[PDB]
Design an enzyme around this catalytic site. Sequence first.
Site, PDB file in Angstrom:
ATOM      1  N   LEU A 122      57.256  28.610  32.121  1.00  0.00           N
ATOM      2  CA  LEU A 122      58.084  27.796  33.002  1.00  0.00           C
ATOM      3  C   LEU A 122      57.222  26.999  33.969  1.00  0.00           C
ATOM      4  CD1 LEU A 122      60.973  30.216  34.040  1.00  0.00           C
ATOM      5  CD2 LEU A 122      61.138  28.218  32.565  1.00  0.00           C
ATOM      6  N   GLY A 123      57.727  25.824  34.354  1.00  0.00           N
ATOM      7  CA  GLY A 123      57.255  25.131  35.537  1.00  0.00           C
ATOM      8  C   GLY A 123      56.158  24.113  35.301  1.00  0.00           C
ATOM      9  N   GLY A 125      50.499  24.770  36.473  1.00  0.00           N
ATOM     10  CA  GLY A 125      49.161  25.083  36.941  1.00  0.00           C
ATOM     11  C   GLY A 125      48.657  26.463  36.555  1.00  0.00           C
ATOM     12  N   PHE A 126      47.867  27.070  37.444  1.00  0.00           N
ATOM     13  CA  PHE A 126      47.245  28.364  37.180  1.00  0.00           C
ATOM     14  C   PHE A 126      48.199  29.536  37.427  1.00  0.00           C
ATOM     15  N   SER A 152      51.692  31.966  35.992  1.00  0.00           N
ATOM     16  CA  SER A 152      52.221  32.510  34.738  1.00  0.00           C
ATOM     17  C   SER A 152      53.644  33.023  34.932  1.00  0.00           C
ATOM     18  CB  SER A 152      51.303  33.609  34.220  1.00  0.00           C
ATOM     19  OG  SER A 152      49.968  33.164  34.157  1.00  0.00           O
ATOM     20  N   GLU A 172      65.875  36.568  38.974  1.00  0.00           N
ATOM     21  CA  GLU A 172      67.100  35.987  38.431  1.00  0.00           C
ATOM     22  C   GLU A 172      66.958  34.469  38.343  1.00  0.00           C
ATOM     23  OE1 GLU A 172      70.747  37.445  40.165  1.00  0.00           O
ATOM     24  OE2 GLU A 172      72.002  36.047  39.050  1.00  0.00           O
ATOM     25  N   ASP A 231      55.495  28.811  52.846  1.00  0.00           N
ATOM     26  CA  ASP A 231      55.149  27.748  51.906  1.00  0.00           C
ATOM     27  C   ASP A 231      56.390  26.933  51.556  1.00  0.00           C
ATOM     28  OD1 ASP A 231      53.436  26.123  50.371  1.00  0.00           O
ATOM     29  OD2 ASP A 231      53.298  27.562  48.707  1.00  0.00           O
TER      30      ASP A 231
HETATM   31  N1  LIG Z   1      59.427  23.282  38.122  1.00  0.00           N
HETATM   32  C1  LIG Z   1      59.936  24.580  37.962  1.00  0.00           C
HETATM   33  C2  LIG Z   1      59.509  25.623  38.801  1.00  0.00           C
HETATM   34  C3  LIG Z   1      60.066  26.889  38.717  1.00  0.00           C
HETATM   35  C4  LIG Z   1      61.069  27.151  37.790  1.00  0.00           C
HETATM   36  C5  LIG Z   1      61.487  26.107  36.940  1.00  0.00           C
HETATM   37  C6  LIG Z   1      60.924  24.836  37.009  1.00  0.00           C
HETATM   38  N2  LIG Z   1      62.524  26.555  36.128  1.00  0.00           N
HETATM   39  C7  LIG Z   1      62.828  27.847  36.393  1.00  0.00           C
HETATM   40  O1  LIG Z   1      63.735  28.493  35.865  1.00  0.00           O
HETATM   41  C8  LIG Z   1      61.893  28.311  37.471  1.00  0.00           C
HETATM   42  C9  LIG Z   1      61.966  29.586  37.889  1.00  0.00           C
HETATM   43  C10 LIG Z   1      61.173  30.294  38.902  1.00  0.00           C
HETATM   44  C11 LIG Z   1      61.764  31.176  39.806  1.00  0.00           C
HETATM   45  C12 LIG Z   1      61.009  31.843  40.757  1.00  0.00           C
HETATM   46  C13 LIG Z   1      59.637  31.643  40.841  1.00  0.00           C
HETATM   47  C14 LIG Z   1      58.834  32.297  41.913  1.00  0.00           C
HETATM   48  O2  LIG Z   1      59.532  33.030  42.746  1.00  0.00           O
HETATM   49  O3  LIG Z   1      57.610  32.150  41.990  1.00  0.00           O
HETATM   50  C15 LIG Z   1      59.037  30.769  39.940  1.00  0.00           C
HETATM   51  C16 LIG Z   1      59.795  30.106  38.989  1.00  0.00           C
END
Ligand SMILES: Nc1ccc2c(c1)NC(=O)/C2=C/c1ccc(C(=O)O)cc1
Lengths: 268, 9
Positions: free
Chosen positions: A12-13, A15-16, A18, A84, A130
């Site tokens: 998902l998302g 960079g460095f 996971s 979630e 952040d």
């Molecule tokens: N650009 C982008 C960034 C994040 C997410 C995403 C698309 N689509 C998702 O479902 C994500 C879920 C998610 C939820 C929590 C966390 C965290 O608490 O670090 C990270 C990612």
Amino acid sequence: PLESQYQVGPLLGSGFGSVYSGIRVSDNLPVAIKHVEKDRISDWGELTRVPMEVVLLKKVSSFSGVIRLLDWFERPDSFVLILERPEPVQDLFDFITERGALQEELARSFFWQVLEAVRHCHNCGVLHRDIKDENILIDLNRGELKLIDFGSGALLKDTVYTDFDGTRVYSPPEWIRYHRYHGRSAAVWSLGILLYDMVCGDIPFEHDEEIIGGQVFFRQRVSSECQHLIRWCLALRPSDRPTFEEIQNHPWMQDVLLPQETAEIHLH
Amino acid sequence: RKRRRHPSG
Ligand SMILES: Nc1ccc2c(c1)NC(=O)/C2=C/c1ccc(C(=O)O)cc1
């Protein structure tokens, strides 16, 4: 078992890090599966010694404006966090990239929901540290925002902070100049950066000198009321910044849209 | 102008 409870999908998302898309086998609940390397963990907490991020997520895991931690596992070299996952979502950074400067009605709705979420964190004893568009998800169907990634957060305290692991271009000038800050007033500064970002289409400052310079140039048409709220949040002296209550009582913040209205008018 | 993400750290 870890690989038995979840069907693990793709990364998902943007960079460095996971974080994997996933679905919980028990009920097909969409989840986000976040892996944290023990060797990379900044601060540790205790419940059982766990990364501080787990401690903070548990404290805020009640209210839907913050990401909900459903479970976590420890592994030899890592922790795994089951979050979630709303869908369909786009993060606020990509959303602003694609759409440009947001209409004030939409930015008002978004900013309001960010305020309610951060207030929830503080009431739970948690300082996010952040706040930025990259750490905000938009549920495109419900019109609801979610604050994510508590990996730079800390327990909320009233004394001075002298450490910081968040995003430098959202950090306040007292951090730049003196490497110290108080939590609430630093949070309000980052909220000012965020509000400018929403109504102008990008953050106001990129360099230390701009951050400490205390001048806010508006690159888009922005109402006088919104400009005033932004400049107030970006007061150079921390004690000159508004409280959360003053932000939400500001005249620019009145008559906010409900989440569902926001989705129907601006996201559908 | 160039809008970009900014990693934490
Ligand atoms: N650009 C982008 C960034 C994040 C997410 C995403 C698309 N689509 C998702 O479902 C994500 C879920 C998610 C939820 C929590 C966390 C965290 O608490 O670090 C990270 C990612």
